[PDB]
């Protein structure tokens, strides 16, 4: 299937007036060039292949950067650097989020890919053997680690991937896991109804998708015990929506995000650059 060909047409002198309409109806303009000019025949062999939803979304996008370290930790703060936990979301970054938010609702499987990088913290503390990483998906309710070597990492039921530094970026598919019939990109509501004369706090409650969304937690550790040389790591998380359906198109984000909601920032709500005059080519 191709985009529209142009038919051979000459002029008109007619009570048929395709150039006029009434957009008050909620209909967009419909007229095409053959309605208002003399046209030649042009066969259109060109297709809209690359603007299908699958084509538009068919990219692995970075959604977050996580940090983990491997060293001899002697303080609570340093023990907490030996592993990391991250609430799974696309709202840490802006690019994939903005593309998804052309739509109100979506349904897709997810390809997740990871890029893992290291550097030496210092040069005077010898070397470090090649590191193995554990990335554990903790679904809502499953116990979260409090130490890099606690019982949770045995991962009998949670899916884990063990990644060997220098190997191909690890990758796995996630089904459409939504508890509704589609994912909601926008939710105009609350998680509960506050009732007349209840003692529950109404002063510090939130609004929208943040009150209801929970895709669980990614937990990452270096499996190796400490070397004399401290190693610091970054884990870049990539998402590609595949087998995509979307519903109810929206105007795209016009101004910077300032969090997980639709809120905007007072110093960043002037996207247009003023033109010199209404008559500026």
């Amino acid at each position: 299937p191709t985009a529209q060909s142009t038919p051979l047409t000459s002029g008109v002198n007619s009570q048929e007036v395709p150039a006029l309409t009434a957009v008050e109806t909620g209909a967009s303009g419909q007229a095409v060039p053959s309605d208002v000019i003399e046209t030649r025949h042009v066969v259109n062999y060109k297709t809209r292949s690359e603007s299908t939803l699958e084509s538009f979304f068919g990219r692995s996008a970075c959604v977050t950067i996580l940090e983990v370290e491997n060293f001899n930790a002697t303080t609570d703060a340093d023990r907490k650097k030996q592993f990391t936990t991250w609430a799974i979301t696309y709202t840490d970054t802006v690019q994939l989020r903005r593309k998804l938010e052309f739509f109100t609702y979506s349904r897709f499987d997810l390809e997740m890919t990871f890029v893992i990088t290291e550097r030496y913290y210092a040069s005077n503390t010898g070397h470090a053997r090649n590191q193995v990483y554990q990335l554990m998906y903790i679904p809502p309710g499953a116990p979260r680690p409090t130490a890099w070597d606690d019982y949770t990492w045995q991962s009998s039921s949670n899916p884990s991937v063990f990644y060997t530094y220098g190997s191909a970026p690890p990758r796995m598919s996630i089904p459409y896991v939504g508890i509704a019939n589609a994912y909601s990109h926008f939710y105009d509501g609350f998680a509960r109804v506050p009732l007349k004369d209840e003692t529950v706090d109404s002063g510090d409650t939130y609004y929208g998708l943040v009150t209801i969304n929970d895709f669980g937690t990614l937990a990452v550790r270096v499996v190796n015990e400490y070397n004399p040389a401290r190693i610091t790591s970054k884990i870049r998380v990539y998402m590609k929506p595949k087998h995509v359906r979307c519903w109810c198109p929206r105007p795209p984000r016009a101004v910077p995000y300032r969090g997980e909601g639709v809120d905007f920032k007072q110093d960043s709500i002037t996207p247009l650059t003023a033109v010199e005059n209404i008559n500026t080519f």
């Binding site: 985009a3 529209q4 060909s5 142009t6 150039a19 006029l20 309409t21 957009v23 008050e24 967009s28 303009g29 007229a31 095409v32 060039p33 309605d35 000019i37 046209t39 259109n44 297709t47 809209r48 690359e50 603007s51 084509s55 538009f56 692995s60 802006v94 903005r98 052309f102 739509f103 997740m112 890919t113 998906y137 899916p159 191909a168 990758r171 796995m172 598919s173 089904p175 459409y176 508890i179 019939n181 990539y238 519903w247 109810c248 198109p249 105007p251 795209p252 984000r253 016009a254 910077p256 002037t270 996207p271 247009l272 003023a274 033109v275 010199e276 005059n277 209404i278 008559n279 080519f281």
Partner: protein, 234 residues
């Protein structure tokens, strides 16, 4: 084992690759689908919807609701009412339309652009307005007598509120670039009083029209890219 030999590309992560991968949640039972209204299949479906051009984005009106309405009056000036380049991805006024926003995820565009004008004066206001598209390579039109040598429509104001002017696909290249570019310049859209707006007494002598842009069914885009319209601090 089966003798194999690794080729170039082995172990790379290409972000536009299209491979199978093991499922982390095997034999998961997805929520059954239901019919939801408003399913979209193609971004070009969204490009065919009219959205308002912020045509009057001048100092004091840019980034206000007053950036959209195009000033009209009953004075019959020979000066153009508005003038804009056919640069639908890169122009300061077209880039933030729905079509402009979609084009800024692509490198290449082709096809015809539809400009629909809604007159929002009183019922008692009459007028004739010339809407012109001049393909590029000549003096940009600043007078009606130059504008009327191009592709144009004479709009008679009346019961039918709206008039559609086409910028038909007229290009050397098969695609134009979604950037400001001399080689793929699109030409000039202008607007003049053909007669003038006339009102009787007890009627506003100044008023507005709204300009909408949409893609025609001959329109398509290529070469997915990141937009310059969203960013974040690092």
């Amino acid at each position: 084992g089966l003798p194999t030999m690794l080729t170039p590309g082995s172990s790379q992560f290409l972000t536009s690759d299209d491979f199978q991968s093991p499922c982390a949640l095997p034999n998961f039972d997805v929520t059954p689908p239901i019919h939801i209204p408003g399913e979209v299949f193609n971004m070009m479906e969204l490009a065919e919807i009219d959205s308002m051009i912020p045509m009057n984005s001048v100092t004091g009106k840019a980034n206000t609701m007053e950036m959209y309405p195009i000033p009209l009056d009953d004075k019959g000036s020979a000066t153009p009412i508005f003038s804009i380049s056919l640069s639908p991805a890169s122009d300061k006024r077209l880039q933030y339309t729905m079509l402009g926003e979609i084009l800024n995820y692509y490198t290449h565009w082709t096809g015809s652009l539809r400009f629909t004008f809604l007159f929002c004066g009183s019922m008692m206001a009459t007028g004739k307005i010339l809407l012109s598209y001049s393909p590029p390579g000549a003096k940009p039109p600043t007078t009606r007598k130059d504008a009327m040598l191009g592709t144009h429509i004479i709009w008679d104001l009346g019961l039918q509120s709206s008039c559609t002017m086409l910028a038909p696909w007229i290009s050397n290249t098969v695609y134009r670039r979604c950037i400001k570019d001399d080689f793929t310049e699109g030409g000039y859209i202008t607007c003049f009083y053909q007669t003038r707006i006339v009102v009787p007494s007890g009627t506003p002598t100044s008023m507005f029209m709204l300009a909408f842009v949409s893609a025609c069914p001959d329109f398509s885009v290529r070469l997915l890219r990141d937009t310059n319209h969203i960013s974040q601090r690092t």
